[PDB]
Design a protein around this ligand. Sequence first.
Ligand SMILES: *[C@@H]1O[C@H](CO)[C@@H](O[C@H]2O[C@H](CO)[C@@H](O)[C@H](O)[C@H]2NC(C)=O)[C@H](O)[C@H]1NC(C)=O
Ligand SMILES: *[C@H]1O[C@H](CO)[C@@H](O)[C@H](O)[C@H]1NC(C)=O
Lengths: 121, 121
Amino acid sequence: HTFFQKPESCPPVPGGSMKLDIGIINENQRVSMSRNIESRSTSPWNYTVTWDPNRYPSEVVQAQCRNLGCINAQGKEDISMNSVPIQQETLVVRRKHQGCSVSFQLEKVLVTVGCTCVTPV
Amino acid sequence: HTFFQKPESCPPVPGGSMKLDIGIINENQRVSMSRNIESRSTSPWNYTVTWDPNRYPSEVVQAQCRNLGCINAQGKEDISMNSVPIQQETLVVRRKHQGCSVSFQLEKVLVTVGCTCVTPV
Ligand SMILES: *[C@@H]1O[C@H](CO)[C@@H](O[C@H]2O[C@H](CO)[C@@H](O)[C@H](O)[C@H]2NC(C)=O)[C@H](O)[C@H]1NC(C)=O
Ligand SMILES: *[C@H]1O[C@H](CO)[C@@H](O)[C@H](O)[C@H]1NC(C)=O
């Protein structure tokens, strides 16, 4: 909403654009999860690394649940139990235009981060 | 971060500021997961809401697995199995300065979105 604005009575800026500072705060943090988490899960998933050279991050990994149900101790799928996806709403930056008139714009993308096992209702 | 540069063959501006266009692409979307997914999951989790007025989005919801083990049909924790979190790297905007000198800078935050049930290692 009003998070990107200025008070009307402010000195104008061409294009009706805002100031985006350089540098990503915490650009260094790394995600840490169990190894092969998407295989060892009772509700395994597969990963698709979607790519876009005009988007930051360029690589956005989407997950897809491997089965309709969950896996049990034996390694068998159990359809009495459901494998459901977990969605995270995120933000990525899109790079607009060519030449020196390059600009950026926020984009909202929903990411499926993996799957969990639920009991159907 | 080479991503936010302009072609060298361009006339330099200020000291270092990019152009952020107004509007959020696809702002109209809303994550849709199973009802009470966080409770019906064999590896359930609770939600902790953090709030910061100078950040977009303001509310970043962190998740925390309720148990060490997963839960069986009966309803008891089974530590032969593990409730582990799923972490996603996201981008949030941080608001800097006040009034007309308002400026924005990207910030990366790891969000723990929910939990899945895995086999121990
Ligand atoms: C999940 O990913 C696996 C890759 O490990 C997919 O693999 C299956 O289908 C492939 C088709 O090209 C075959 O090459 C694989 O041999 C086959 N193996 C397995 C274990 O699935 C699989 O289809 C994907 N599953 C889903 C639901 O998308
Ligand atoms: C989740 O765990 C918290 C403690 O961290 C507990 O107080 C809360 O009530 C739990 N959730 C439910 C639905 O009981």
